[PDB]
Symmetry: C5
Subunit: 217 residues, 5 copies
């Protein structure tokens, strides 16, 4: 983390063991690419030098698989950034090494000069995680997901909602998918119960109506 000395001096202290425990526990239970890890890190990564955002990501337990896809995607995003900002004709500017904080000494990362670099680094990592989770089809194809046999509608809803959120499409498309799919991919037992309960509004029904009917009596 970056420490703001009273005189405005900036120094680096190791990520507090407690912060690793929270990030790691989210990483074991939910995916390293899971939106929950993406959020936790974004809440706690306002005070983290560029190197730490990268190190915490490497240290967090998770499959070598996802850590492999993220490393490739993170590099790919960095490539695009570099073609975008040719080296600076006047002034230091930002090079991929500076933004990824490779070649710079830990204390230097805290120095305010890199203020921009922490932000961009977090941006790529939080872009990388989003891209990896979508590719991992951990949510899966949105229409593809269907109710498990003898499964609570809420659980199907949880998978269906995650898939609808993961797809990179405008909100209106997500809304139509959320209302229409909830019934189409639903199991017959909830489907029939919803069909009678919500009548002919099954397509125009909200998630709340469908989840206060199949899950409940």
């Amino acid at each position: 983390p970056i420490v703001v000395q009273a005189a405005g001096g900036r120094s680096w202290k190791a990520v507090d063991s407690v912060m690793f425990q929270q990030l790691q526990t989210v990483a074991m239970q939910h995916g390293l690419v899971s939106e929950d890890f993406e959020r936790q890190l974004a809440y706690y990564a306002t005070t983290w030098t560029s190197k730490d955002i990268l190190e915490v990501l490497a240290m967090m337990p998770g499959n070598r698989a996802q850590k492999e896809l993220i490393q490739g995607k993170l590099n790919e995003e960095a490539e695009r950034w570099r073609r975008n900002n040719p080296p600076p004709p006047a002034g230091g500017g930002l090079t991929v090494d500076q933004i990824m904080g490779v070649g710079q000494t830990n204390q230097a990362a805290a120095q305010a000069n890199m203020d921009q670099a922490r932000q961009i680094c977090l941006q790529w990592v939080i872009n990388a995680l989003r891209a990896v989770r979508h590719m991992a089809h951990r949510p899966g194809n949105p229409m593809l997901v269907k109710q498990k046999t003898n499964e609570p509608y809420e659980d199907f809803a949880a998978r269906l909602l995650e898939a609808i959120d993961a797809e990179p499409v405008t909100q209106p498309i997500k809304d139509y998918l959320k209302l229409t799919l909830s019934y189409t991919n639903a199991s017959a037992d909830c489907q029939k119960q919803m069909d009678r309960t919500l009548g002919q509004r099954v397509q125009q029904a909200s998630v709340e109506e469908k989840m206060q009917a199949c899950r409940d009596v």
Copy 2:
């Protein structure tokens, strides 16, 4: 959280990682809408700016399903509040944005001006969670719940008590349901044992009598 400087100045510090771990552990084991989460948050949300009450809720792991119902219910409650307090003719008053702390800068949230806003925000979230848990019928219909085959009476009692508590009805109704249902929805093995043990007081028996008889020899 809000920090009261000795000079009475108010500053914001991130929720301590430890506080997220306790809230998250309750959220994984018990529901994000579970009464236990509702209590923990209410014990630790006296010092939390309006934004944090909302952020901690979003970050806590839980189904996207419940996080979907809560977001809708929280908005619905905010709507009712706004129809109730038309904009202020004289003075700032409270707008939905101020109470939900959207559009305000983090440090500003701590400023005492928003004292009222933290309270209302916590009120809606703690109302929202209550409403979502009741809708989720996670306790289920109160009379509907019945003893599982080969299940300890205490476990049936735990489901029966939760359902009786969740229903939004006056305490006397809850008392009648607690005494009468405990025997009616009970399995025959406890039912017969209680019938002989408590004699003709099975309807007028307390939970203690029924739980010191079927669970015990």
Copy 3:
């Protein structure tokens, strides 16, 4: 908790999140009424105002069932205390509200005037938990417990020891039950092995002899 300012002033700080995690983890793994929770709370409840002893108890995860029995038993004990100390003819004395710290403001609880109240409150809660665990027959009837088929003698010993401890009887009775039952309620496989190993001292054998024989070769 109660904070002793250097000038002897007493102020209240929220129970540290860490202390709730330890108490909660004991409560999920072992019973809220389990002796382990009874001990942890008694080690950490010397500095807790009366309100906190009551709040921590409500917040700790546990069945609504036990939380129901404890609430009734705690009230029952408070009743007995009140019939015992009729209101004070001269002086404030202690009323049920003061001891349960209901109607008093948080900061007031820390004030030394209530020193007696924290002690009594902890006394009732720690009496209540003991009574609830015994009623819950979570240890069960002491003679009733018997060795599970294909179960280590140590495990049977653990249930047998807990039941022998829970029964509210003089130590000599507990000693006789511990020595005699260990063999009588034991499974035939340990029983026969102990019968040959300890010879005719099976009744006068200690737990150590029986547990260094059936568990071991």
Copy 4:
């Protein structure tokens, strides 16, 4: 714990909740008598007054069974110490009560006078745990342990190594048992694979050779 004030004054602070969590987690996962608990406590018991070493032991979750054997063994060791040091003819000396810190007030325990008592108390507890684990045959008889069917050689090695360590015999005996038993108590599938892989050195083979052969291709 004992706090060394700058003026050399000694005061007692409660064991930090975090220290109980680490000791408790080791106690649930590994035995209260497990060598791992024996080590953790010995690393953190240099600053603990005699009373705390005893209290932490009582509070740690574990079977009432082991807590029963340890209490007896701890008393037995204290007995031997007392027959060894008849009361002091001149000077306070150490009595069983002082070493076990029973009858002394908490703050008094921290006072340097008891410096010797903390050491002896920890000595008996760490002797007691060692004795209880050996008696519990949790490692079991060393030769008796054999490879489980369809079990990794490393797992058999882990049980075999623990049993070889638990037996109170000179290191050379442990070395012979470690080299010879590793093959004799091994399952035929590893046995045959090792017999071909290590040739006629199966008796003179180290653990490394045997574990780089059966576990690996």
Copy 5:
């Protein structure tokens, strides 16, 4: 840990209980020799005297098996170091005891004189863990690993990637193994799906292509 007093004095404080919890949790879930433990320790072992690096390793829960192989390998590496640096003809130099910090008092370890010793000790332990994990074939032979029946390609990828990383061979060899094996050791269901999806690039395909095809629709 080593504490840098403002005057540059160096003092030792016990490893904070929190740091043991993070290292232990990684050790229970992942191997004590697992790369994740190797990393965590390397992030937190810049401020640890030589003795602590060794003690934390002994205290961390893990099989007595791996703790046996590591102890042997650590000694073996120390041997090589000693044949390499014959005792110092002029000056203290480093002896195996100084680097392993055996015979030196705790406070002395923090003294800057041993600065070199902490680094070397960490070097051997982090070399030892790497060697033990490779020997443990916990990743296993790289070509040997194959897709489990009805297993997600990502899981096979995770085992395949770990094995490819563990083998001590130049990166180009790892790249060829990663691209070629991913298809060869893959199960027929992913194999056939990949064969059609990636066409004739199955050998020249990256991990990303193969994991966006078999795992996803």
